[PDB]
Design a protein around this ligand. Structure first.
Ligand SMILES: NC(=O)c1ccc[n+]([C@@H]2O[C@H](COP(=O)([O-])OP(=O)(O)OC[C@H]3O[C@@H](n4cnc5c(N)ncnc54)[C@H](O)[C@@H]3O)[C@@H](O)[C@H]2O)c1
Ligand SMILES: NC(=O)c1ccc[n+]([C@@H]2O[C@H](COP(=O)([O-])OP(=O)(O)OC[C@H]3O[C@@H](n4cnc5c(N)ncnc54)[C@H](O)[C@@H]3O)[C@@H](O)[C@H]2O)c1
Ligand SMILES: NC(=O)c1ccc[n+]([C@@H]2O[C@H](COP(=O)([O-])OP(=O)(O)OC[C@H]3O[C@@H](n4cnc5c(N)ncnc54)[C@H](O)[C@@H]3O)[C@@H](O)[C@H]2O)c1
Ligand SMILES: NC(=O)c1ccc[n+]([C@@H]2O[C@H](COP(=O)([O-])OP(=O)(O)OC[C@H]3O[C@@H](n4cnc5c(N)ncnc54)[C@H](O)[C@@H]3O)[C@@H](O)[C@H]2O)c1
Ligand SMILES: CCC(=O)CC(=O)O
Ligand SMILES: CCC(=O)CC(=O)O
Ligand SMILES: CCC(=O)CC(=O)O
Ligand SMILES: CCC(=O)CC(=O)O
Lengths: 254, 265, 265, 254
C-alpha cells in the first residue's frame, strides 16, 4: 500500500511570473509544503508583496527582479537564489503574456516579444537551473507552464499557440538530456483560468466561446494547477519525465 | 496556497484485477486512504487474500468473484458492492492478460479473448457502475488501466495494443456523456511494471532469443525509457489515489503516461 | 523533379464494404487505375452492382459475399480473390456500421456487434491478406478506414469511438511486424461524409431534438470543421489511391485525417 | 470513380530554402507540374543555378534573394514574385538549419538564430503571402516543412525540436483564420533525408542511431516529400487544412 508525497522541506524552488495568478499559487503552495521559494518577476514590487504574504504565513521566500527575456537577468537571479538558499531543486518556467491579433494584422514586434518571453525565457531559466542541478548528479525538476494551446489552436493567437507547442519540444529534449543527471521535465497544460491574463480578455462569451470545448462548462482553477505542480514536484520517482498533463475539464483529451 | 487531497473516507471503490499486481496496490492504497474496496477478480480465494491484507491494516474490503467478460457476473458483483457498502464512487477497470503472437500466427480465439477482457470488461463495469453514479447526479470516478501501448505499438501484441488504444476512446466518450451526471473518466498509461504479467515474460523471451535476461530488460523492455527504469506499482497507485481524491473534474477525459519517458504525451 | 504515381496496373485489391459509400468509390477508383478489385460485402447482389459499374468502365472486379465478422467467410473470400486474379497486393478494411446510444443505455449485444465488424473484421482480413503478402516477401498495402473518432470522442458513440481508436493500434503493430515482409499499413480518418450511414442520421436527429436538418449538419456534425464542409467520397478515394500507389513505404504506420480541420493531427 | 490531381498550370508558388535539398525538389516538382516558382534563398547564386536548371527543363522560375529572418527581405521578395507572375497561390516555408549542442552548453545566440530562421521565417512569409491570398477570397495553400521532431525529441537539438513543434501551432491557427479566405495550411514532417543538412551530420550510426526508430531502416527521400507536397498543393478541396502528415518509415506513428 502507498500514499501521496507532498513534503518539499529542504528543497529550493524558483517560479517565474510568481507575483500573480498561477505562478503565485504554485509559489505559495510550494512554500506551504516547506520549500524555500524564489518569487521571480519583472514586477519586483509585486514579487515582494507575494514574499511578504509567504513569510507572514510562516514560509521562506526571496523576491528576485527577473526579466526572463534577459540572459544576464536570468543568470544573476538564479545565482541570487543559489547564494541565498544553497541550491536550486525546482524550476517552474511560468512567466507569460497574451497578445491577440490575426496573422495578417499582427506586428512582427509582438510576434518576437511573445516568443522572447515564452521560449527564450524557458531556454534561459532551464540552462541556468540545470547548470546547478547537474553538479554531482543531484538532479531536480523543471516544469513548464504550457496550455491546451500546446496541443490545439484558437483564432488570433498565432505566437502564443506557436510558443506553447514549442514548450512541449523543449520539455521532451530536456527529459532525454537531463536523465543522465537525475533531471526530470514536465509541461502542465491548463484550460482557461480566471487570472488577470484572462479577466483582462473577457471585457476586450464564457459558455459559448471560452468554455465551449469543455465537457462541463467549468474554468480550470489556480488550485487545480498548484495541486498538480506540487504532486509533480514532490513525486518520489522520475516516472513522469517528458510528459505533458492537460488540466482543462475535457478541452483537448490527451 | 493549497495542498494535495488524498482522503477517500466514506468512498466506495471497485477495482477489477485486484488479486495481483497494479490492481492489488491500487486497492490497498484506496483502503489505506479510507475507501471501502470491492476486490473483483476471477477467483474468490485470490481476491480474499487482498481483502485479508486490507483488513490486517484496519481497512474495509469485500472479495467479489467477477469474470469481467460476463455481463451477469459484472452486474451481480457491482450490485453486491452497492448492497454491502451503500454505493459505488470509484471504478478502476484494470483486469488484463497478455497473449503474444504476430498477427499472421495469432489464433482468432486469442484475439477475441483479449478484446473481451480489456474492452468488454471496460464497457460492462462502466455501464453497471454509472447506473448507480448517475442516480441523483451523485457522480463518481472511472479509471481505465491503459498502457504506453494505448499510444504506440510493439511487435507481436496486436490485440493488446488494439485494446489499450480502444480504452482511450471509451474514456473520451464517457467524459462527454458523464459530465451532466458529475462522472469523470481517466486512463492511466504505465510503462513496463514488474508484476507477474511481466516477470513471466523475462525468462521466456531470454530462452527464445538466446540472450541474457538483462538484455530482455534493457535492450527490449526499457529500451525507449530515458533512464532504464521500470515503472512501479507504487507509481501507479499514487497516480490512481491523486486522481480518485482530486477535488474537481479538471482531469476528466485525460490519459496520463507513467513510463520514464517512453512515449512523451 | 518528380510527379505523383497513380498506376495500379497488375495489382489486385480487396475492399470490404465496397457495395456502398466510401468503399464503393475506393473500389471504382482502384479499378480505374488498373487494379483488379474484390468487392466484399454482406450480400453478393449488392457487391455485384459495384462490379457492374467497374465492368461498364472497362475494369476487372469480382463480387465476394463476406461477413467480415466470420473467420470462415473472410478466409474463403480472400482465397477466391487470390484464386481468380493470382494474388492480393492491397487490402482496404472499410466495412462498418453505426449504432448510437449512451453507455448507460447501450445493449451489450450492440457493443459486441460493433467491435466484431470494425475490429474482428480488421484482424481477420489483415491476417488472411498478409498470409499471401508475406509469401516470398512480395509485400502489399493494408489500409484501415478509421475516423476523426480514431482521435477524439462524440456523445453516444462509445463502441464506434472505441473501435476507430483500436484500428490505430492494429495499424501501428502491423507497420512493425510487416516491415521485414515489405508490408505497409495506414489509417485514413475521414470527418463526416454524406454516405447512406450519415444521410440516415440527419432526419433522425432533427426529429429527436426538434431542430432543423440544417442545425443537425451545421451545429452538430460540422461544428468543429473550420469551413462547415463535409468530407467527400472523392477526397477519401484520392487519398486511398495516393497511398495504394505510393512508390515507397514512407507512410507505413501513419494515420492521415481528412476532416476540414476537425481534429488537427 | 476519381483520379489524382497534380496540374499546377496557372499557379504561382514561393519555396524558401529552394536552392538545395528538399526545397529544391519541391520547387522543380511544382515547375514540372506547370507552376511558376519563386526560388527564395539566402544564397542568390545557388538559387539562380536552380532557376537555370528549371528553365532548361522547360519551366518558369525566378531567383529571389531572401533571408527569411528579415521582414524587409520577406516583404520585398514576395512582392517581386507577385509583380513578376501576377500573384501567389502556394507558399512552402522550408528554409532551415541545424545547430547541435546540449541545453547546458548551447549559446543563447544559437538558440535565437534557430528560432529566427524556423519560426520568424514561417511567421514573416505566412503574413506576406496571406495578405495577397486574402484579396477577393481567392485563397491559397501554405505548407510548413516540419519534422518527426515536430512530434518527438532527440538529444542535443533543443531549439530545432522547439521550432518544429511550434510550426504545428502556427499551422493550426492559420487553418482556423485562413478558412474564411479559402487559405489551407499543412505541415509535412519528414524523418531523416540524405540532404547536405544531414550528410553534414554523419561525419560530425545510420542503422543504430539515425534510423533506429524506423520500422525498415530506410531514409525518407526528397522525392517522397516532393510527391506529398504536390499531392497537397494540387488537392481539389480544403479537406487537409490544419493537418500534419509524417513521412518517416514508421518513426513516430501519428
Ligand atoms: N490564465 C489562463 O487561462 C492560462 C491558461 C493556460 C496557460 N496559462 C499560462 O500560465 C502562465 C501564467 O499566466 P497567468 O494567467 O497566471 O498570468 P498573470 O498575468 O496572472 O501572471 C503572469 C506574471 O508574469 C509576469 N511576467 C510577464 N512578463 C514577464 C517577463 N518578461 N519576465 C518575468 N516575469 C514576467 C507578470 O508580471 C505576472 O506577474 C503563462 O505562461 C500563461 O501563458 C494561463
Ligand atoms: N505490468 C505491466 O507492465 C503493465 C503495463 C501497462 C499496463 N498494464 C495493465 O495493467 C493491468 C493489470 O496488470 P498487472 O500487470 O497488474 O497484471 P497481474 O497479472 O498481476 O494482474 C491482473 C489481474 O487481472 C485478473 N484478471 C484476468 N482476467 C480477468 C477476468 N476475465 N476477469 C477478472 N479478473 C481478471 C488476474 O486474475 C489478475 O489478478 C492490466 O490491464 C494490464 O494490461 C500492465
Ligand atoms: N460516412 C462517414 O461520415 C464516415 C466517416 C468516417 C469513417 N467512416 C467509416 O467508413 C466506412 C465506410 O462507411 P460508409 O460511410 O461508406 O457507409 P456505408 O453504409 O455506405 O457502407 C458500409 C458498407 O459496409 C457493409 N458492411 C456492414 N457490415 C458488414 C459486415 N459485417 N461485413 C461486410 N460488409 C459489411 C455495408 O453493407 C455497406 O455496403 C466505415 O468503416 C465507417 O465507420 C464513415
Ligand atoms: N534533411 C532532413 O533530414 C530533414 C528532415 C526533416 C525536416 N527537414 C527540414 O527540411 C527543411 C529543408 O532542409 P534540407 O535538409 O533540405 O536542408 P538544405 O541545407 O539542403 O537546404 C536548406 C536551404 O535553406 C537555405 N537557408 C538557410 N538559411 C536561410 C535563411 N535565413 N533564409 C533563407 N534561406 C535560408 C540554405 O541556403 C539552403 O539552400 C528544413 O526546414 C529542415 O529543418 C530536413
Ligand atoms: C491558453 C489558455 C489561456 O492562456 C487563455 C488564452 O488563450 O489567452
Ligand atoms: C504495456 C504492458 C506491458 O508493459 C507488458 C507487455 O507489453 O506485455
Ligand atoms: C466518424 C463517422 C461519422 O462521421 C458518422 C458518425 O459519427 O456516425
Ligand atoms: C528532423 C530530422 C532532421 O531534420 C535531421 C536532424 O534531426 O538534424
Amino acid at each position: 500500500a502507498t500514499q501521496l508525497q507532498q513534503d518539499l522541506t529542504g528543497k529550493v524552488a524558483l517560479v517565474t511570473g510568481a507575483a500573480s495568478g498561477i505562478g503565485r499559487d504554485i509559489a505559495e503552495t510550494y512554500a506551504k509544503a516547506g520549500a524555500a521559494v524564489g518569487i521571480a518577476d519583472i514586477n519586483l514590487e509585486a514579487a515582494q508583496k507575494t514574499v511578504d504574504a509567504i513569510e507572514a504565513a510562516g514560509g521562506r521566500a526571496l523576491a528576485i527582479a527577473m526579466d526572463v527575456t534577459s540572459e544576464a537577468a536570468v543568470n544573476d537571479g538564479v545565482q541570487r537564489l543559489v547564494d541565498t538558499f544553497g541550491g536550486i531543486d525546482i524550476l517552474v518556467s511560468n512567466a507569460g503574456i497574451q497578445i491577440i491579433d490575426p496573422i495578417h494584422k499582427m506586428a512582427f514586434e509582438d510576434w518576437k516579444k511573445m516568443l522572447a518571453i515564452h521560449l527564450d525565457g524557458a531556454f534561459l531559466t532551464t540552462k541556468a537551473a540545470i547548470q546547478h542541478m547537474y553538479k554531482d548528479d543531484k538532479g531536480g525538476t523543471v516544469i513548464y507552464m504550457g496550455s491546451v494551446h500546446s496541443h490545439e489552436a484558437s483564432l488570433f493567437k498565432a505566437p502564443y499557440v506557436t510558443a506553447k507547442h514549442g514548450l512541449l519540444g523543449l520539455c521532451r529534449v530536456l527529459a532525454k538530456e537531463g536523465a543522465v543527471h537525475n533531471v526530470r521535465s514536465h509541461v502542465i497544460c491548463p484550460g482557461f483560468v480566471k487570472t488577470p491574463l484572462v479577466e483582462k480578455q473577457i471585457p476586450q462569451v464564457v459558455n459559448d466561446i471560452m468554455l465551449v470545448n469543455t465537457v462541463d462548462k467549468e474554468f480550470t482553477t489556480v488550485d487545480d494547477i498548484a495541486q498538480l505542480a506540487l504532486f509533480l514536484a514532490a513525486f518520489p520517482t522520475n516516472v513522469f519525465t517528458g510528459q505533458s498533463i492537460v488540466a482543462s475539464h475535457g478541452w483537448f483529451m490527451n
